[PDB]
Design a protein around this ligand. Structure first.
Ligand SMILES: COc1ccc(Cl)cc1CC(=O)Nc1cncc2ccccc12
Ligand SMILES: COc1ccc(Cl)cc1CC(=O)Nc1cncc2ccccc12
Lengths: 306, 306
């Protein structure tokens, strides 16, 4: 019993973090096979960040201008290339700790674990969701750039995020491992607008199912609703509209609890209109949207990894 | 910027988890040097749990009755002994992945990371606090027994908790690594009472300081208070009394924010009496007490580990 904001074990990722230094800038890199991945703004100075011409800046750099350290192991750069917003440094040594991995571009609403790193060394691990406006509400300080987000399916590590920048609003933006930003952001120091941040409705429903599994049932009501009538109320409170694909994903949780998805939607509709009235659900006084349906099944069934 | 419930990286602990089987019971064990640590109720059947005589049950077992698996590596038991509520199995192979470690018995209010394991394999990692009544509000399923809680100081892993049982109330109880239970619990299947669970006041204050660091300042008031007048209100709301040792621990946070500890206590006193009135602090509608002063400094200054 119980429910926690649970992250994946980070051991397979800790062995891939390295320190990347170009000139005077130092940030984190990801060492897989004989390639190191890192944010391309490592080649910039503080003055370049206002309006950097990355192509012109990169041409002034050679292989010997990049210093890659894996603890005390010095890797020698024998080739460099720029793919979108990431730098790919070819090194002479393949990482012996390379796990089975793939690069994945996630969709908004999906969750992943972040291994926050500084100077190539791990600081901590936490779980977060990609917001509908393609930001993340992380915990990052200066020097955390190049920290990665990931999921684990069995023996395979799926890398999905590389941290690049903190916006002036305090939220965080980054890219996939091919260097494509999530959202409309660019890697320069300028005011950038993130869109409206909405609540991930399918995740809230999954969390309400977790509450029922763990014994919290006070919010269950006798009313029901339809999909169109629920979405009319959800959009009023800046909730994402629910689709039939979302209903299909929630199927296994409906079966385990015996509560129809539309019935759970009716309970949520009353929580949106009437509030929680000083009560709590799973130790929280707010509706939580950082747990996917898969996260709930994983935590409540005990899925393990290599 | 930002603040998350952050766990330690678990890599150093993942390499120490093994599977322990005695007869038909299988749970997790901790492999350090050539000794495996596991809960002693691994030698029990389902019927023994109601009123087990561990001494009599252990005498019917020999070294070859214990099966220890480290993935696919079979460890041979060459000696066994019972220390309080843990079993110490001497094996023939020393763990090559043994990190620098120590055994520590923590005090209530301190936090640690839990590596939840099943059949010797990691499932996830989360951060929690030892409640004042010596329980933890974890996330555990059947087979998680032997999962360990830990902290990391630089290169040293401090093991502080081994999971033993879920109480009928849904909270969790366990021992230190010398086999001494935290709290008045015993390892048998019987109704057991946990005391009143109080809020860890020094942790709430540390979290309010974290909120100020991250830009949330609406709760700061113009009033002040004394230590005796605050404790009179705190005890009314089942908060732990604040002592001078707590004030000394909060010193570095007072300096960083320029807010005196007693001034922060006055803000907390108004939050206890007037509530939060639909507002949030660090994305939460409840006062949070699972962050120690050390956790706040660590997250807001970027302390790293090996
Ligand atoms: C304003 O600096 C820019 C501009 C553009 C780009 Cl692409 C990258 C950066 C570097 C950056 O934002 N680093 C940080 C990332 N996370 C958290 C941070 C917390 C404090 C200071 C820097 C933090
Ligand atoms: C009632 O079983 C007893 C009695 C006494 C003792 Cl010493 C140990 C046990 C085993 C136990 O509680 N296992 C579990 C530990 N965490 C979570 C659990 C969730 C579901 C089922 C068992 C769970």
């Amino acid at each position: 019993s119980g429910f926690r904001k649970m992250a994946f074990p980070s051991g397979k990722v800790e062995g891939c973090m390295v320190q990347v230094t170009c000139g005077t800038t130092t940030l984190n890199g990801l060492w897989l096979d004989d390639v190191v991945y890192c944010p391309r703004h490592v080649i910039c100075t503080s003055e370049d960040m206002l309006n950097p011409n990355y192509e012109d800046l990169l041409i002034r750099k050679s292989n010997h201008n990049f210093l890659v350290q894996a603890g005390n192991v010095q890797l020698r750069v024998i080739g460099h290339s720029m793919q979108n917003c990431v730098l790919k440094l070819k090194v002479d040594t393949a990482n012996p700790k390379t796990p089975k991995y793939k690069f994945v571009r996630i969709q908004p609403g999906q969750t992943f674990s972040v291994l926050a790193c500084y100077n190539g060394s791990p600081s901590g691990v936490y779980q977060c969701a990609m917001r509908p406006n393609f930001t993340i509400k992380g915990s990052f300080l200066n020097g955390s750039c190049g920290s990665v987000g990931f999921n684990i399916d069995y023996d395979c590590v799926s890398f999905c995020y590389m941290h690049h920048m903190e916006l002036p609003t305090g939220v965080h933006a980054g890219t996939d491992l091919e260097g494509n930003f999530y959202g409309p952001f660019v890697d320069r120091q300028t005011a950038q607008a993130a869109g409206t941040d909405t609540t991930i409705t399918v995740n809230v429903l999954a969390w309400l199912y977790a509450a029922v599994i763990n014994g919290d049932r006070w919010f269950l009501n006798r009313f029901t609703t339809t999909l169109n009538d629920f979405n009319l109320v959800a959009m009023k409170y800046n909730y994402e509209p629910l689709t039939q694909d979302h209903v299909d994903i929630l199927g296994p949780l409906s079966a385990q609890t015996g509560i129809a998805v539309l019935d759970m939607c009716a309970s949520l509709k009353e929580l949106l209109q009437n509030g929680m009235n000083g009560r709590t659900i799973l130790g929280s006084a707010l509706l939580e949207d950082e747990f996917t349906p898969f996260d709930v099944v994983r935590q409540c069934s005990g899925v393990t990894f290599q």
